[PDB]
Design a binder for these strands. Sequence first.
RNA 1: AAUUGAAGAGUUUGAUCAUGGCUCAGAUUGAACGCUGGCGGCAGGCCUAACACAUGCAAGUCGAACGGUAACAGGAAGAAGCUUGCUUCUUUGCUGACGAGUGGCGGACGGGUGAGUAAUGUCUGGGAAACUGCCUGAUGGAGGGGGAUAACUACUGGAAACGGUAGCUAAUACCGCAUAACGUCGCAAGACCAAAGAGGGGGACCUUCGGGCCUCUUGCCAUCGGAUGUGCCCAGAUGGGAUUAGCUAGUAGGUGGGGUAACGGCUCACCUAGGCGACGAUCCCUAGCUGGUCUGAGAGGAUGACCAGCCACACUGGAACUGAGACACGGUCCAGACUCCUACGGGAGGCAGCAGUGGGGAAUAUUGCACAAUGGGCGCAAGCCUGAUGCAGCCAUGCCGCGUGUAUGAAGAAGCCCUUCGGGUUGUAAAGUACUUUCAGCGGGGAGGAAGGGAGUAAAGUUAAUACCUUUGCUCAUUGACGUUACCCGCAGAAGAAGCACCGGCUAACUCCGUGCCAGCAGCCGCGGUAAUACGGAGGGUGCAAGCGUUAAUCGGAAUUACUGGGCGUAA
Lengths: 666, 86, 205
Amino acid sequence: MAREFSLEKTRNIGIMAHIDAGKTTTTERILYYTGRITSAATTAAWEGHRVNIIDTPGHVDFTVEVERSLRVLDGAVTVLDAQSGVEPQTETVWRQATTYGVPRIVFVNKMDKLGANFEYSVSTLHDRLQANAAPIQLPIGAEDEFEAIIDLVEMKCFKYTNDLGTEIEEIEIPEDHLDRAEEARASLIEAVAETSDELMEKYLGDEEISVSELKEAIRQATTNVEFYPVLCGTAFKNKGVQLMLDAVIDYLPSPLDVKPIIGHRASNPEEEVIAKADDSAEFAALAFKVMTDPYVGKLTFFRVYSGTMTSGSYVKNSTKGKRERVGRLLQMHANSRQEIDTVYSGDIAAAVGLKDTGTGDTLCGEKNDIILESMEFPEPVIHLSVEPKSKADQDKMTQALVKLQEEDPTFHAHTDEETGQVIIGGMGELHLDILVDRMKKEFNVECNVGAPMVSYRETFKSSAQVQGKFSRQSGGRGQYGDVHIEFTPNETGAGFEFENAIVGGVVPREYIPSVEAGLKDAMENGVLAGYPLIDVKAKLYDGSYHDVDSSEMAFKIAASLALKEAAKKCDPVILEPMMKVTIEMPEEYMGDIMGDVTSRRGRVDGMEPRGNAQVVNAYVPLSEMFGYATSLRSNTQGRGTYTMYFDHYAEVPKSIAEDIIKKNKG
Amino acid sequence: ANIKSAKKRAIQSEKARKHNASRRSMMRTFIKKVYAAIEAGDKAAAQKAFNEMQPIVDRQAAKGLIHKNKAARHKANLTAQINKLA
Amino acid sequence: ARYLGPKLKLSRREGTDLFLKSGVRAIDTKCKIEQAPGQHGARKPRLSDYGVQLREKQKVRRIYGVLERQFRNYYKEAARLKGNTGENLLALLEGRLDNVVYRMGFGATRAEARQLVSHKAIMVNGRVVNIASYQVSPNDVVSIREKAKKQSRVKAALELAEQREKPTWLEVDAGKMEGTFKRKPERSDLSADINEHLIVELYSK
RNA sequence: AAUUGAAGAGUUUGAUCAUGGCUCAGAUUGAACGCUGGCGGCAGGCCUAACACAUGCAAGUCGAACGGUAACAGGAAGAAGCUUGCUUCUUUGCUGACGAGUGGCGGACGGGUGAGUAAUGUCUGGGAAACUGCCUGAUGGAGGGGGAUAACUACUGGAAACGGUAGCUAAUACCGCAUAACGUCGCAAGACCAAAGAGGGGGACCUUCGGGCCUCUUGCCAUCGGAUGUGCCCAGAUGGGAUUAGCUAGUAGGUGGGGUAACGGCUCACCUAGGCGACGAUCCCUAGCUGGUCUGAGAGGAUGACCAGCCACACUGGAACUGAGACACGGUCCAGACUCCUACGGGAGGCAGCAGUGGGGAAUAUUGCACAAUGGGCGCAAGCCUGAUGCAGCCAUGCCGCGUGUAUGAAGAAGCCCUUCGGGUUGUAAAGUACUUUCAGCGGGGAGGAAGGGAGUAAAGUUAAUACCUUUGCUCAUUGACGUUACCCGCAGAAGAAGCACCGGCUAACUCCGUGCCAGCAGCCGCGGUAAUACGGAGGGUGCAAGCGUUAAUCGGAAUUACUGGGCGUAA
Ligand SMILES: CC(=O)O[C@H]1C[C@@]2(C)[C@@H](C[C@@H](O)[C@H]3[C@@]4(C)CC[C@@H](O)[C@@H](C)[C@@H]4CC[C@@]32C)/C1=C(\CCC=C(C)C)C(=O)O
Ligand SMILES: Nc1nc2c(ncn2[C@@H]2O[C@H](COP(=O)(O)OP(=O)(O)O)[C@@H](O)[C@H]2O)c(=O)[nH]1
Ligand SMILES: [K+]
Ligand SMILES: [K+]
Ligand SMILES: [K+]
Ligand SMILES: [K+]
Ligand SMILES: [Mg+2]
Ligand SMILES: [Mg+2]
Ligand SMILES: [Mg+2]
Ligand SMILES: [Mg+2]
Ligand SMILES: [Mg+2]
């Protein structure tokens, strides 16, 4: 009838880090520890506190999962490798969490690794991440020697006697480490003192900071995302894991502590409705994950921001504007999946039997009409031309793409009309690889990917006057038409500009529109390599007509003939789509980026020192740009980002153009 | 079986099946002896064998192993053959 | 379920007063009865047999305020009932409590009378009835609630009824505000304007 | 009184008559889609994949069969666990209950589905050669013994599934014996066949102190009846195809034996050479049948969701067993396909029961509540079980009812639209002024579905007894999921409630302005190239209304398969 754990006790946390930082190991250990004495989120109990943990991937390709998790999470734990410290993807996940303003604590894992330097790791936090971080704990020894951790806040020591995380003997700080601990505690106070003016004055007064007093200030600072507590330990050797859990309860915010989400009323988008974490308030939940369990069926995970939900009820998806039958509510635990009857505010739960529900949707009561702000996912960085191996697969391919698009927001699929080609878009090579393989097996659709075909255009390089004449009196009815047109190269981007300079009505007014129509149709067809002719002006200066044989169709034919002869004299050239590329990277990799551009037949338009990452503006052929994402990340150590948008059509290099003609010919 | 009663009924049916088969075999054995005696041509032997069968078949019909019509048919058919055999 | 548009337009279209107003003033003052409603209302086009039959059926519906579905069911019942289908149909439309109330003079208009029925003001044989479609049988006492007696609108309606011709099949007493449905109105009693034969034809096309 | 019953139109031509097809106006639907959407009642709701299924539930009950007594409360006893006997801790089927087991009955009902089947089906009308738990009539019994065995106990192998071995023990379990004809067999004489006891109470009577005896209640056995159900036979009727004409060899018949509850090539041996078919055999295709439903003036045509009867089926293909009844949805065995668990040594399963999942699809709902009522199983009863059934949820899916106000209100305002630039139309429509509040919301009160079953209390019967028990009165306290019930009263406020298609003709409704054979429209005829009542948009109108259109589908109109009720000189 009542929630077992109060809103205060609830702790929705997430684990984020670089690849192989030890997220899975940490989560597994956490679950074991909470459990003793899978899915999207697992519920756990620690010191009479509900801890809903979500493990997020480290790869840039799976940034989606980090993004969606952060939206529906209160706190987070950043795991770091002791040897390497902050790594490229740690920076990415940090910035993501900064956007959502998620309070975070740092755990320096792998203290047993060779080259492990806690101090170095802490330094990287300050330099690379430029964040107010300070150690709340100090390690005693490094690598193999590391066998003890110091609680600086309480000035205590814990001697781990084994790698089983049991029989830990709490002892007094070693006198040798005591001096170090004192200095560290001083620094800890100072950092939190910057956040807490009261604490600062207490520090300035040189009055011994109470352990409770300090903890309260640290809690506040962390919750305000102004200070970042730094912990240490080894998950593999079961050291510091328990202390981290304690710090989660002591520092990471509760659903109440976190700032309230404001949802725009559906009826009045202008109207803004703040949603507090009150169970009595109207129910409001956000679906963040949509998976299909093999046993129960489709499982939609959601986070109850406000109100309460009971199983066997009807709710309304404000986003979709449709009623949803909440038949069953499952809560995933460390081992088994238990069916809950009621979900309260600040709780993460999975609904079984929901239909037409996607990630980012606001599920609410029928009376309720609030729409909580949805999550923002990035745009594809890599595009590939997917296609089925067989025609039978094409049907299945369509269905597969739909489902995949629903499951993964960042995955996108579309069909380019010009090329008539379905193009898949993703956050990286690894991402699209996984998606393709899934189609091959799960969906059983054998597909082959490749470079997206590029649509080219043509234009006349020279200006020439040409006459087009038609005559057909061979069989019965005779048709005649004559037109003198001048095809002059038009300013790039201006487009077709037909000029009626007919004087004395040499061409009848009624036939003149048909002349243009004929040209347009002929220009739509290729004059060189079957590519639409663009950026050409046609001037109808002179012509002729035979009242009897004058037919609009004849003039249309005459117009086509004129364009043909123009091509023979106007030097038609192939044009390629050029894209403005905006690349942002640390100045260290600037030379490499510019080199890559000038290697891909690109030109640097200029540069600008936006923030701490120099932004380079450049124009590069679309065909050349294929595969820039991977190379960019290779050159920038996965610290580079780019955006490409079509700018203009430019002439293809004669050699490349020659190839295009050959290809289109056969 | 999934139902408790079904499990029990299966056990009880096997118990019955065995009992019934033992009784049925014995009855048939006795009937065959009469038929064999008729084939042999010994009216006295046939009559003697029939007199042994009569109580058995009648009791079996009463128990429910066979029907009274079945018992009657056996006695009637044999009697006719025995009388002709004489 | 009810027509809530301009009542005068209906009468203008049919080219005859359908008694949709109280009748305190001349319909002519209220609207141009002669002209049909609309921009082209003045022009009078030739009407085909279908058009003639349709207008007749519509007229009767408009007078008694019955929608097509319920009216069609009435026709079927009339055909089922032994006798002249056309006349039977008219009798059914008359039997409606709402019509009875208006005719008794408890309501100024059938629209108003219907509001009285819906508001439970009317009592048939001492029993509250809130269905206008209710068919009042012969020898039935139709009274009005005590609260309804107090309503000033009822009193005014009675006055208008005095001006109108008195139904020969209804015995109504003022003050008591109680009427008696003596019998079903005969075709002779019913207006001769109604061409029931056309309606029968339309519903047998 | 059941008796009402029969409509045309457009389209071949320069025009005409005829012929003939096409199209249209009407009903009906398990409907779907688009747009729209206030309430209530009643009903309906996978037509697709007899596709595959996670999870719970859908068949148990009886201690008045039996050995018991694990489990909880007692009953005495009791170291009384206990110390004030304060508290009440050991015992024992003792004893109300009661796990597991043995036994009985049910599980062959109820519920689902229509795959197969053109007839070992259905329907209609008959027939003889049968059987039938429970229920009910009549006439007699129910005597006296034996041998087992589960549970249990000891031991022991399993990951599990579950077992193995040696003792042990009871019965309404099992089996002889006795007796038995209104039974069966037989010409007759003869021969032969059955049982079960268990509860309630109590007086002479009694040891074996348990009982016994008396009586009451229930059950058992035999035979003959009833009722009910079921098996079997026959005739007629119940689709299409000859671009299917021959088919058959247990086949057709006979005799004898065996077999069945019973008739019978049912089966087998033998003998005969038959049997069937143009009145359609054989073969192929399609399909559950019916009462009925829809349409039609009728004759017909179409159709067989929901309801009721019948049949068939239960993962697929076989097979028996048990039983009154099955060749058995939630039983067994074998085989197969498929899936699952595992300790890898082996196991497990069948939603075409109710929910529900995945899939397929244009498309069809909740893993709901109660056994209150009806009905069913078991029981002495109380009671227990019941996804039957009663209700609730969702859905405008249909049918029906209702509301979204009523009256008044003219320079008839504004605005829009048209305009003959005068006005007109929108339009009493608005505003305004009076006025009533259903329904909705809020609050309050409050039917019936409830009959019985209990505790007894009295009388009658009951017999030894006034016992017991039964029956009938009588008294008393209770028995509802729906349910915040139907319904009534009060509350304040017109508040909270109108949409959709159409306007060239057919066919009710017409203008303005765009567009200019384009863009579009379109059931049919046809529209669109300078205004187009046909498109596009606006005003106005028309038809319907919480619906309105569209698509699909059936019949009608269609005398257009013409039995009713048509034609063949030139139209077939
Ligand atoms: C649990 C967690 O943190 O991330 C999990 C969850 C994870 C991100 C998975 C990698 C990858 O399939 C992910 C994508 C985007 C792959 C493409 C689609 O199918 C998505 C619908 C899918 C959602 C999440 C998922 C399934 C994980 C990884 C990454 C493994 C690394 C490599 C190189 C394959 C992981 O478990 O380490
Ligand atoms: N040396 C060391 N290795 C560790 C530690 N914790 C985890 N690992 C290992 O580092 C790897 C981390 O893998 P995983 O937990 O999946 O990391 P994730 O990619 O961040 O989820 C594994 O091989 C772990 O066994 C630790 O404390 N020390
Ligand atoms: K015709
Ligand atoms: K045969
Ligand atoms: K079968
Ligand atoms: K004829
Ligand atoms: Mg991991
Ligand atoms: Mg079939
Ligand atoms: Mg016909
Ligand atoms: Mg003819
Ligand atoms: Mg001819």
